[model samples]
Target: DWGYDDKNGPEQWSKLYPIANGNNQSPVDIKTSETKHDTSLKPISVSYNPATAKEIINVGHSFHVNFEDNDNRSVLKGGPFSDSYRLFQFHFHWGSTNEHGSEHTVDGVKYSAELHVAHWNSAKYSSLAEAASKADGLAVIGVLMKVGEANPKLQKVLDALQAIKTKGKRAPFTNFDPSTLLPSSLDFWTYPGSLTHPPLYESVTWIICKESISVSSEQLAQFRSLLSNVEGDNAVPMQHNNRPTQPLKGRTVRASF
Candidate 1:
């Protein structure tokens, strides 16, 4: 099993998986000075139905809210995308402290935390697994999180974490609207990259929002309380789960400002 620990960390991943060192890897540092501002980019279109939220799971690496993506009830389109992408799940990455945890940084500045809403191309692939292997299969929305006032919308997710305190645990979750979790500004940076995790497939179209949502310090503490290990064993907090920023490798990052 791969994790953020030194022995199984991102630096050691390429030894087991060759693609980890690929040219188009993800979680790159976004240098705004060099990013191209494209006027032709369309506004991002996100349509998520509250009823599509199915369950919340503690998957050891991170906690995720899995959506019912069988149908196109909730999907992302426009921006850097040409086809509609179905929302599969949404998860977060955070550090042990408030200083740094975000996978992608802006001008070398890291955020308190990060949110990833994973999606797959429904127009071209029959299943998410199929899309995961192809170059243009996945489209993920990245939203940076900062410490501020309590986010009531996020409290709903934090409230559900206790039910799934350990790895492999899950509970029914419904009527949750992911759109409510987003910040007011949809202005984002677009690029092509790979998944930050293992397999490291170069299939993702990254749409990272310029603005970030706010969460209180207390809310962030609750996120740390969620266990990565199961009961009866040592309780390991899933902190510092973010992957380090990989090289841009000459890829273009377009901003819709």
Candidate 2:
């Protein structure tokens, strides 16, 4: 398997998976703080039925957090226009050093961490990969993480990691709602853009919430104890899982009051 220490990190991933790699990657630097925005383009209201989420597991996909098949009402109802988009998967971006971790760079500055809640427009696509090609088809909620209050939800999710700690180890998860994991405020920033990952699809609608969720130091510590660690034993401690800043490509990032 390809690990981070193999001298073939994300830069080399494309060669291995050509199709997924061709897409424009996401989480580039937007220089959000420095960029001017049109108040008319406020972010959309976001919602989802957490009850229907089938399974929640920390897959070994990105050496971070990711959930698969998180279907909800918006996917089945809106068809496309509704902001209640269906969440296909969730993932995290951390810093190689704790000083920063956010994947989306703001004016070339990265945060401590970022949580991506990925959603797709079921009305327009058959696969999550396909939806990534359309602006409305994809909705990514960016949650910035900082080292402050202890995140209560971290323990709730980590308690189950013991069983599915390894790659491909899935277990049953019930009575869990992703909404509860979010912060109190819905304020956010928006932009027309692409995915942060390789094959970075350019048709994504980015919604970056302003509020930072709470996770205790202990909880973050647990997340660090991922199953398939790409970095060596030292691993450099994934302080920032975020990507470096990229040009906005003349794209506009919107925010809500």
Candidate 3:
């Protein structure tokens, strides 16, 4: 029952989820000057099958475009990963405004939004839950979003938000390739971190893209229109759902140039 409000926000999460204060928590500020270039890191490869896209659901904090994870139809490989990871779902973290919505920051600057493409290590675990139980069971590709021209590719998912305005609402969504949202360059900053929300598992190997995609002001409004509460509740409009940056704890962030 944790949320982004002052009462149960990030500051209060550690009380319920003890791992929230763990050493490897995510959304760390990637100081470009401090990050080292690792020659061993491989270039990220993401091949998403459009047919595998299943549905879009409002899960309170954000909407997720769930994919059929039964097989490797849509998956992410390489970029500091030893095994291939099956794409489970994808979601975004954003604030109430375009000024700051992203969980992770670049040298102290915040982006308008951040896209998280989640994957489970099918090679090692039976399911996302099983994979999440291990320290090396998950790999998430984080793509930062800057405010500029509207992204036509992103609009596809944004247009579906109206149907899932309330929490738990969902609709069938198909044939959308997630890779379309990527920027021209695949350069990224790699690190080990936890989930940005509750049940904050420190199992994710975060590969944050250095280049950012574009999002427009109008599109951000579409995201903010979502309500975190159900139809009957005191509608908590989904805004500023992002968890702020946490301590680096001496973690080494490698860069893939």
Candidate 4:
């Protein structure tokens, strides 16, 4: 029921979803100078099987690539997590223009776009939905996107976007390794946070990558062309689908170099 419009956007969400204003909210501005360097943090580990990719769908807000999580075919481990988190899906958030779209900022600098690879704590929770309500139910890998060369890995998913141009539309997607979309650097910033969307569950352990991947202007423009509504209703473009950063609320951000 919540949206990105002025009257119904994030500022108004707390009226209905009480947790929207809860402590440890996400999309916080990561001030590098203030972040603590933790030597105890282990290197992040990602194991994604290409066969786990299932479908790509336009979910009104953004395009999400859903993966098969019935098993641990694709899982993320290490970092702040005590057990492996099962890969559920991945999505992107971008602005109307290339200057500011990412949900998280680094030292007050916003990237062109942001990618989120969402995972659920399968070992401790029975179901993804159930886990989402707990304190440590989710682990998300946040990758920033800068304007540069065209990313072929992103192109593979983009090429299928035409079929799912409208909300609720989905197309079969297979054999794509989500890891290939990540930057070479594994260094990241870890913190406790909530989901950027409504329901605003404070259950996520966010691992934001230090390095960003590249995407050309033309390629980035295609994301803005995506429709928020279904066919035959003015076809409004889903631009600026990102939430503003929230306060850190006394949480300490740890960095692993």
RMSD of each: 1.0, 4.4, 1.0, 0.9
Per-residue lDDT of candidate 3, residues 81-108 (tens digit): 8889999888989897897898999999
Question: In angstroms, what RMSD does candidate 2 have relative to the true structure?
Answer: 4.4
Question: lDDT by residue for model 1 over 1-257, one digit each (tens)?
Answer: 88888999899999998999899999999999999999888888889998999999998988889999889999998897778999999999888887677899999999989999999999999999899989999999999998888888887898898899999999999998798888797999999999998989999999999999988888888888888898778999877789999999989999998
**Count of clashing residue pairs in every prediction:** 0, 29, 1, 0
Give the C-alpha lDDT of model 1.
Answer: 0.90
| Location of the lowest summed lDDT over 10 successive residues in candidate 4 | 231-240
lDDT string for model 2 (1-257, tens) is: 33343355555555764533333446656555655554555335456555545555544545333334434453322212444466665667665555466777665666777777777776567767767666567777788777677776766567776766555566665555566666687666666667665545666777666677755556666666665533233333333334455555555565454
Instruction: List TM-scores for all candidates, in order.
Output: 0.97, 0.77, 0.97, 0.98
Worst 10 residues of 1 by lDDT: 93-102
- Give the per-residue lDDT digits (tens) of candidate 4, residues 1-257: 78887888889989998887788898999999999999989998999999999999998888989999999989999997779999999899898888788899999989999999999999999899999989899999999999888887788978899899999999999998899989897999999998999889999999999989988888889988899998777888888788899999999999997
Clashing pairs in model 4? none
Ordering by lDDT: 4, 1, 3, 2
Off by over 4 Å in 2: 1-6, 13-25, 30-33, 63-84, 127-129, 229-241
lDDT of 4: 0.91
The Cα local distance difference test for each model comes to 0.90, 0.59, 0.90, 0.91
Cα lDDT for residue 45, candidate 2 = 48
How far is 169's C-alpha from truth in model 2 (Å)?
A: 0.7
lDDT at residue 45 of model 3 (Cα atoms): 87
